[PDB]
Design an enzyme around this catalytic site. Structure first.
Site, PDB file in Angstrom:
ATOM      1  CG  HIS A  40      -0.460   0.402   2.617  1.00  0.00           C
ATOM      2  ND1 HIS A  40      -0.002  -0.416   3.538  1.00  0.00           N
ATOM      3  CD2 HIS A  40      -0.351   1.683   3.165  1.00  0.00           C
ATOM      4  CE1 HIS A  40       0.369   0.252   4.575  1.00  0.00           C
ATOM      5  NE2 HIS A  40       0.161   1.514   4.361  1.00  0.00           N
ATOM      6  CG  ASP A  84       0.169  -3.894   2.840  1.00  0.00           C
ATOM      7  OD1 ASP A  84       0.614  -3.445   1.789  1.00  0.00           O
ATOM      8  OD2 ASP A  84      -0.100  -3.246   3.843  1.00  0.00           O
ATOM      9  N   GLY A 175       2.582   6.736   8.644  1.00  0.00           N
ATOM     10  CA  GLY A 175       3.913   7.330   8.360  1.00  0.00           C
ATOM     11  C   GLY A 175       4.893   6.202   8.701  1.00  0.00           C
ATOM     12  CB  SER A 177       2.708   2.512   6.081  1.00  0.00           C
ATOM     13  OG  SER A 177       1.445   2.574   6.718  1.00  0.00           O
ATOM     14  N   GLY A 178       4.944   0.208   6.109  1.00  0.00           N
ATOM     15  CA  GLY A 178       6.059  -0.366   5.334  1.00  0.00           C
ATOM     16  C   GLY A 178       7.290  -0.684   6.161  1.00  0.00           C
TER      17      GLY A 178
HETATM   18 MG   LIG Z   1       8.641   2.539   9.569  1.00  0.00          MG
END
Ligand SMILES: [Mg+2]
Ligand SMILES: [Ca+2]
Length: 223
Positions: A40, A84, A175, A177-178
Site C-alpha cells: 500500500h 501487503d 507514516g 507503514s512499510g
Molecule cells: Mg517505519
C-alpha cells in the site's frame, strides 16, 4: 509510533525511509540491492534513503538511491490489505557499513509472546498529529491470533498478525507503514494497518513475512 522512544542515531541500521519529495513510508534493507516495504506504499518515483536518523537534516550517514523497479505481491488486495508486501530494487547497490546494514529473513514464523522492535518516522499522537524528525522505536509483543481476530472480525487472514498492547497507548501509526517489525534478529513483520493508533482493543496489524520468504527469494534472484 505512539508511546515509543527515540531509537538513537543509526541504531536500526536496516531501516529505510521511502521519499517522493517527502517521507511517506518506511522499508527494510534485505541485501545491498533490495528493500521490502508494504504494497500500500506503492508509488512511482521513489528514492530510498538509507542511514537516516533525522530525515530533515543531512547528518552525514545518508545514502539516497533511486529505485529501478518495484514489484507489488501478485495477490495484493487493496481492499482487505491481504498480501501487503512489495519489493523495491535499488538503481545502485548500497554500501553497507555500521550505519547501513541489511536484516535477515526468517527461517520460521515467530510465536505469540515474542517481543519485537518496531520503528519509524510516523505520527506520535493517538489523537492528534505530531510527526517526528528522528526515528522512534517501540518494543511490543506478538499477540495471540485469537485476540487479533476478536478485535477485527472477519478481517484477519493467515498472512497477518497483531502486535501491541490491548490496553492501547503504544502502537505504530501512519507514516510508519512499510517499516520493520524485527523479532529475534529476523524481519517478521511489515507495518500494515490498524484502527486509529494506540486505541484500546485495536492493536496494529502486520504483514506476516515468514509466509513470503520463498516469493521474496525467487523474485530477487530473477530481477
Ligand atoms: Mg517505519
Ligand atoms: Ca538525515
Amino acid at each position: 509510533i505512539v508511546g515509543g522512544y527515540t531509537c538513537g542515531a543509526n541504531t536500526v541500521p536496516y531501516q529505510v525511509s521511502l521519499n517522493s519529495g517527502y517521507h511517506f513510508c518506511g522499508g527494510s534493507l534485505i541485501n545491498s540491492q533490495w528493500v521490502v516495504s508494504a504494497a500500500h506504499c506503492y508509488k512511482s518515483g521513489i528514492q530510498v534513503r538509507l542511514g537516516e536518523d533525522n530525515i530533515n537534516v543531512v547528518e552525514g550517514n545518508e545514502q539516497f538511491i533511486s529505485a529501478s523497479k518495484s514489484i507489488v505481491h501478485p495477490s495484493y488486495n487493496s481492499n482487505t490489505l491481504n498480501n501487503d508486501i512489495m519489493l523495491i530494487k535499488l538503481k545502485s547497490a548500497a554500501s553497507l557499513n555500521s550505519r547501513v546494514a541489511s536484516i535477515s529473513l526468517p527461517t520460521s514464523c515467530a510465536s505469540a509472546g515474542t517481543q519485537c522492535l518496531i520503528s519509524g518516522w510516523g505520527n506520535t499522537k493517538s489523537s492528534g498529529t505530531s510527526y517526528p524528525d528522528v526515528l522512534k522505536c517501540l518494543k511490543a509483543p506478538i499477540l495471540s491470533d485469537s485476540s487479533c481476530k476478536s478485535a477485527y472480525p472477519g478481517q484477519i487472514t493467515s498472512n497477518m498478525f497483531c502486535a501491541g498492547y490491548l490496553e492501547g497507548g503504544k502502537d505504530s501509526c501512519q507514516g510508519d507503514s512499510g517499516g520493520p517489525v524485527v523479532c529475534s534478529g529476523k524481519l517478521q513483520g511489515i507495518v500494515s494497518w490498524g484502527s486509529g493508533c494506540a486505541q484500546k482493543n485495536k492493536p496494529g496489524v502486520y504483514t506476516k513475512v515468514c509466509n513470503y520468504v520463498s516469493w521474496i527469494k525467487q523474485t530477487i534472484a530473477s530481477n
